[PDB]
Homo-oligomer: A and B are copies of this chain.
Amino acid sequence: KPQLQRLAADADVDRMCRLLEEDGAFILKGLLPFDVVESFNRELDVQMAIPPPKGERLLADKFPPHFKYVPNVATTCPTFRNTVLINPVIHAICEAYFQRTGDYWLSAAFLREIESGMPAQPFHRDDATHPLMHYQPLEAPPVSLSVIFPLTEFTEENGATEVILGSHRWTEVGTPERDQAVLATMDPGDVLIVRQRVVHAGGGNRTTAGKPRRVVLAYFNSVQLTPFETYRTMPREMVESMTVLGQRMLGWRTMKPSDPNIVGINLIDDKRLENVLQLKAADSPALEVDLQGD
């Protein structure tokens, strides 16, 4: 079977965009160096070690207590917020992918851990958080991109993501056979990029030695789509320590859907949100050198 293509970080962006259109998915090999990955895993370990709260938890309360989940990792994991989330290759791909849609931002990024002995997910499309996506025709400009970070090894045995190449062109998911899919076997620091409507499934984890498979799932959506996670409660000091791009990803700035929206979105007082908030950013001084950068 034709396999997922693995591309280095300096690969051609037009090529990556065409892989998304033809295959529906590809892998960035070794995008994140091992020390970034392990610093991220460490930050994630701290979050998972927090004791269970007494209050309501919207997703977690629907699952048994062994459910392993860290929501909105950008607020508790500085490595994701300051390094992974603003990676320039990821954003080069997003800008090409979202060219017909306009601006994009982060809808969600969260950890899942899949224990030994777990079965494989059913094949599905990622059209449930924003159900209107189910009715978008294939020809419409895409409004969502799934970006998948393996934080342990993904192998055939521990449940590497199953992707059915070309399936974004299918009318319905139906009930595909597992052998129609190819495996996104990867090393931590690789990244899997999956186009909207592509049929896929988590592979579960069929190892028996008790080693979980860890994954962070990020959804970059058209700014027309409401973020699943709202980063509005971040403290100002944390927000201002981010770059402009990171503030844009986390909903703190006015954004621009494609024409025929000629104005923008996420604004107030007919002004940009960042101006009403007088928001500073870490790389403002580099983006405005001679004071005439408009």
Contact partners of A56 in chain B: CB under 8 A:
271-272, 275
Contact partners of A227 in chain B: CB under 8 A:
226, 265-266
State A136–B71 Cα separation when bound (angstroms).
31
**Interface members, chain A 5-56 (any B CB < 8 Å):** 55-56
Q: Is A139 an interface residue, CB under 8 A from the partner?
A: yes
Q: Is the contact region of chain A dominated by helix, strand, or loop, or is it mixed?
A: loop
Cβ A71 vs Cβ B226 within 8 A:
no
**Contact stretch, chosen from A115-123, A124-132, A177-185:** A124-132
Contact code string A98-130 (vs B, CB < 8 Å = 1, else 0) = 000110000000000000000000000001111
Contact code string A119-153 (vs B, CB < 8 Å = 1, else 0) = 00000000111111011110111010000000000
State A227–B55 Cα separation when bound (angstroms).
29
**Total copies of the chain:** 2
Cβ B230 vs Cβ A273 within 8 A:
yes
State A117–B179 Cα separation when bound (angstroms).
68
- A21 CB, nearest partner CB in chain B, Å: 17
- A139 CB, nearest partner CB in chain B, Å: 7
- A214 CB, nearest partner CB in chain B, Å: 18
* A135 in complex: contacting residue of B102, B140, B254, B276, CB < 8 Å: B140
Q: Is A84 an interface residue, CB under 8 A from the partner?
A: no
Contact partners of A58 in chain B: CB under 8 A:
254, 263-264, 267, 270-272
Cβ B101 vs Cβ A132 within 8 A:
yes
* A230 in complex: contacting residue of B75, B224, B268, CB < 8 Å: B268
- A sample of 21 inter-chain contacts (CB < 8 A) reads A57-B271, A58-B267, A58-B271, A59-B263, A62-B262, A62-B263, A71-B268, A72-B268, A129-B263, A130-B261, A131-B258, A132-B143, A223-B226, A224-B226, A225-B226, A226-B226, A226-B265, A226-B266, A229-B267, A229-B268, A230-B273
> What residues make up the interface of A, taking CB atoms closer than 8 Å to B?
55-60, 62, 69, 71-72, 75, 101-102, 127-132, 134-137, 139-141, 143, 222-233, 254, 257-273, 275-277
